[PDB]
Each structure stands twice: as C-alpha cells, then as structure tokens.
Design a protein around this ligand. Structure first.
Ligand SMILES: *C(=N)[C@H](C[C@@H]1CCNC1=O)NC(=O)[C@@H]1[C@@H]2[C@H](CN1C(=O)[C@@H](NC(=O)C(F)(F)F)C(C)(C)C)C2(C)C
Ligand SMILES: *C(=N)[C@H](C[C@@H]1CCNC1=O)NC(=O)[C@@H]1[C@@H]2[C@H](CN1C(=O)[C@@H](NC(=O)C(F)(F)F)C(C)(C)C)C2(C)C
Lengths: 305, 305
C-alpha cells in the first residue's frame, strides 16, 4: 500500500551522461555508442543567444572547439553535425555502458523520469508529465541543459526529452532526441508564451483509481454519467475532453477495482462541482494529473527492471 | 527555477541489490563486501509471522537453507548471524560493485531516497522523510522487504533504512542497517499502530524559503514573531516545536534570501491561522514538510554526485 510519485531507477542513464564545453559555455551531453547528443546552443555566447544564427555560429566551429569529458577522461571529437536544435558529436570511442535504447517522441499526457545533471554529473531524479501545452514542470538551473528524460521497458531505455530552456512562468521546454522541440518554442533568448495549460483528465481518473486501491474511497458515489455529460461539465474546469480511447486505456484499472470508468467520472464531476471540502486524496488537496494509467498499474503491481 | 521532490541517482545502490529466498518466503537483500543484509522474517512461514520465536526459528535454519541470487548467479552462503531484526549472510564473494558506504541512524525530519525492489530487481525510486512518529509514507507491496533507504554524500552511500512492514493507515516501518527498528515497532504480525503524527516545522520553514527563492512571495508579510509566541501557535496546529538548533540550521537559507527565520515564522503563523486564501505555494495547496533545509540548499545549488 501507499502511493508515491516514483521515478525509474537511473543507473543506466547515469553511465551515459558526459560534460560538453564549447568556448566558455558548458552543458550536458548524452553519450550512446560513439555519438554525444547535446543542445546546439552550447556554441553560443551570452550575446549570441538573443538572436542566434546557428548555421553561421556552427561554421565558425570545428572539432577541436568541443571538449567532451566522461568522468576524468577527455573524449576526442572527430566529427560534428547539426540535426534540428541538437548537436551530434562523433567521438573516438563507443560508450561501454551504452544500454539498449531507442529515441521516441512522446504524446501530451505521457510521463517520463528526468535525470537532472550539471557538468556531466547526476544531481537528482524526478518524474515529469508532458503537459498538453508541451511544457514540463521541472527543476532546472544554469548548466542543466542536456539533461534527458526517459522511460524504461524492462532492459530498454526509451529517451524522449532533452532540456533546452525555461519559459516566463517557470515552466520548462526542450526537444526530442532528434532536436525537434515539443511545442511552439524556439532556442532563442526571447519572450515566448506557452498556451493555457489544461488538466489531463485520463490521468486524474487513473489517480482516483490509485486512491481507491489504497483505501481512499470517500469521494466515490453511487451515481453514473454519460461521456458527453461529463465532458460538458469538465470543460468549464479546463479539463481535456475524455474520449472512448481514454476509457479503453482506463480498462485494466476499471477491471481490477470493479468501478466502471463512467462511475468514476460521476465522482470526478462531483469533485469539480463541489470541491474537496477540506478532505485529501492520497495526501493531496488538489486533483493530481501527472500519473498515467500505466504509472498506476506499474506501481500497484510491482513491475521491476 | 522549479522546485521538485527529487531522489538521489540510484545507480550505486542498484548494483548492491540481490534476491534472498528461504523456503517459500522470498525478499530483497543488500550485498556489501562479502555480507548480505536482509530482514530476519525471511526465515518465517505465514503462520510463524503471527507469533515468531526468531531465536528458535533461526537455530533450525542452516546456510544451505538460504538461497542468495545476484542476477543469474547464485551466491554460496558460508555463515550467518542475526543482529537485532536483520540477518547478515556471509557469502564467499565480495560484491565487486560495492561503493564507498556507511551505516547511519537518522533522526525524525531527515530525508532519504528509497530504491523500491522486488525479487532483487529495482522497480523505482522516491524520496521519504523519517516522520516524527518514526514511520515513512512509502509505496511498498508484498516482497518489497529488504529494499533500502539511502543518502549520497558525493561518492559515499549512507544506508539508513531497510523496509520490514506496513502499519494500518498505509504507512511503513523499518530498521537501520544494524536491525534496530525506527520507532516502537516489532517484526511480528500483531496489532500495532503508529502514534499520532506531527508536522516537521523546520522542513515547512525550509520549503517556504524555496518558495521565496522561486518567486512565490505572496505569503511574506511585514510582521515578526518571537520563538515562544510562534511555538504556542504551532502546538495548537500539531506542529513540532521549533528549537534554536532548527533556527541555526535555517541560517544559510535565511542569509541567502535576506529574510530572518522569525520573519518567516510570522509568515507560517498567518498561514496556519488563516489559510492559503485559495492560493498554492510551489504548486501545492498544503504546507510541505518533507524537504529539509539541506534538500532546499542542494536543489537550489545544483549539487552533483
Ligand atoms: C540551459 N542550461 C539553460 C537552462 C535554463 C537556465 C535557467 N533554467 C533553465 O531551464 N537554458 C538557457 O539558458 C536557455 C538558452 C538561452 C536562454 N535560455 C533560457 O532558458 C531563457 N529563457 C528564455 O529566453 C525563454 F523564455 F524564451 F524560454 C532564460 C531566461 C535564461 C531562462 C537559449 C538559447 C534559449
Ligand atoms: C515485506 N516484504 C512486507 C512488506 C509489507 C507487505 C504489505 N505491504 C508492506 O509494506 N512485510 C510484511 O509482510 C510484514 C512482515 C510480517 C507482517 N507484515 C506486515 O507488514 C503486516 N503488518 C503488521 O503486522 C502490522 F499491522 F502490525 F503493522 C501486514 C499486515 C502484512 C501489512 C512481518 C514479519 C512484520
């Protein structure tokens, strides 16, 4: 019993974190095989970042301009190229600690662990959801860029995020491992706005099932609702519309508890309309939307790696 | 910016986890040097746990009765001894992945990372605080016993917890690596309840400094209180008494922000008596007490390991 925000064990990702320096700019890189992937703004100075032309900045750079440090060891960069907002550095050797991996582009609502690093060294690990407005609510300081987000499926590390920047409202933005930004953001030091953030509805229901499995059941009612009737109510509260696909994803949790998805929606509707009245759910006074249906199943059935 | 509950990178602890089976009872062990530490109830059958005579049960157990598995390799147990509630199985092979380590007993209020395991394999990582009632709010299932709590001091791993049991309200209990339980709990399936919990006041104040550091400054007021006047209000709300040692520990946070501890106490008093007025602090509608002042400093400085 008990329910916590839980990150994947990070040992496999730790063995891939290196330090990338270009001039006086230092950040992190991800060493897999003989390639190191890092944000392309490692080539900028403080002034370049206001309006960079990465193409010309990179032309003025050659192999001896990039220092890659793995532990106490310098890695010889024997090639470089630019793929979207990510820089690929060909190094003299393959990472002996390279795990089985893939690069994936995640959907909004999906979660991943972030291994926050500074100077190629791991500082901490925390769980993050890709918000519907394509930002994450993380914890990143100067030099954190290059820190990656990932998921583990038994032995395989699926990398999905690389940190690049922080937006005005304290939220964070970055790219997939191909350099494509999540959202309408650019790697330029200029005011940019993230859209209005909505609540991931399928995730709130998933967390309500986790609360039920843990014995937190005060919010359950003997009422029912239709999918349309629930959506008409929830949308006034800035909740994402719930679809038949989302109900199919909630199925294993529904079957395990014996509470139909639309029965749980009637409890969620009541919580939005009447509030929580000083009560808590899994120790929280707000409805939590950063656990996916899979995160609940994984935690409640002890999936190991 | 951004303040998140963060666990230590788990790589170092991952390499120390093994599986320990005795008869039909299977759980996790911690392999350091040529010794495997695990909870002593691994020798118990399902009926023994109601009223176990450990001294007697262990006398009827031999080295050959303990199966220890490190990956696909079975380790030969060449000796054993019972230290309080922990079993120490001497194996014929030192763990080549043994990091620099120490065993410590933590105090209530101090935090640690839990690497949760099943069958000797890591499933996830999260941060916990030793509550004033000596329980922890974790997430553990059947077979999670022997999973450990740890802190990392750059290169040294301080092991401070080993999971043994779960109490009625979904809260957990365990021992230090000497087998001594935190709290008044015993390792027997008998009626036990955690004493009424209190809020860790120094951790709440450290969390408000983290809020000011990140921009949430709405709760700051012109008022100032004494230590005595603060403590008379905290006790009403079930808060731990704030001592001069707690005030001294808060010193680095107070100096970085230029806000006196007793000026932050007036902010906390106002918050306890009159509420949060519909506002959040660091994305939370409740006052968080699981970040110690060292966690706030570590995260806000980007300390690496
Ligand atoms: C990479 N190490 C940092 C990480 C930032 C620093 C503070 N916390 C973070 O997440 N990335 C940057 O410094 C990027 C980088 C230039 C400026 N920058 C920003 O994150 C800035 N943000 C923006 O200009 C905005 F709002 F558009 F996102 C900053 C104001 C410094 C937070 C580049 C090339 C975008
Ligand atoms: C270790 N593998 C498990 C972890 C438990 C199982 C359910 N969730 C957990 O955290 N430990 C146990 O099964 C221990 C073990 C016997 C009984 N047990 C308990 O934790 C039980 N609790 C109590 O006896 C109580 F109420 F006193 F705290 C249980 C009812 C199974 C939760 C021993 C030797 C204590």
């Amino acid at each position: 019993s008990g329910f916590r925000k839980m990150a994947f064990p990070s040992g496999k990702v730790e063995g891939c974190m290196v330090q990338v320096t270009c001039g006086t700019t230092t950040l992190n890189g991800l060493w897999l095989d003989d390639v190191v992937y890092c944000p392309r703004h490692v080539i900028c100075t403080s002034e370049d970042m206001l309006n960079p032309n990465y193409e010309d900045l990179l032309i003025r750079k050659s192999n001896h301009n990039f220092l890659v440090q793995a532990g106490n060891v310098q890695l010889r960069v024997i090639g470089h190229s630019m793929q979207n907002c990510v820089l690929k550095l060909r190094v003299d050797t393959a990472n002996p600690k390279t795990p089985k991996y893939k690069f994936v582009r995640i959907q909004p609502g999906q979660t991943f662990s972030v291994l926050a690093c500074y100077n190629g060294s791991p500082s901490g690990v925390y769980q993050c959801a890709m918000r519907p407005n394509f930002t994450i609510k993380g914890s990143f300081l100067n030099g954190s860029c290059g820190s990656v987000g990932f998921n583990i499926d038994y032995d395989c590390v699926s990398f999905c995020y690389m940190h690049h920047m922080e937006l005005p409202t304290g939220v964070h933005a970055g790219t997939d491992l191909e350099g494509n930004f999540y959202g309408p953001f650019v790697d330029r030091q200029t005011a940019q706005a993230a859209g209005t953030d909505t609540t991931i509805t399928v995730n709130v229901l998933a967390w309500l099932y986790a609360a039920v499995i843990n014995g937190d059941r005060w919010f359950l009612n003997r009422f029912t609702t239709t999918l349309n009737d629930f959506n008409l109510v929830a949308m006034k509260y800035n909740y994402e519309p719930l679809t038949q696909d989302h109900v199919d994803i909630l199925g294993p949790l529904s079957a395990q508890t014996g509470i139909a998805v639309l029965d749980m929606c009637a409890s969620l509707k009541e919580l939005l309309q009447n509030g929580m009245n000083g009560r808590t759910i899994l120790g929280s006074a707000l409805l939590e939307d950063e656990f996916t249906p899979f995160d609940v199943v994984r935690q409640c059935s002890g999936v190991t790696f």
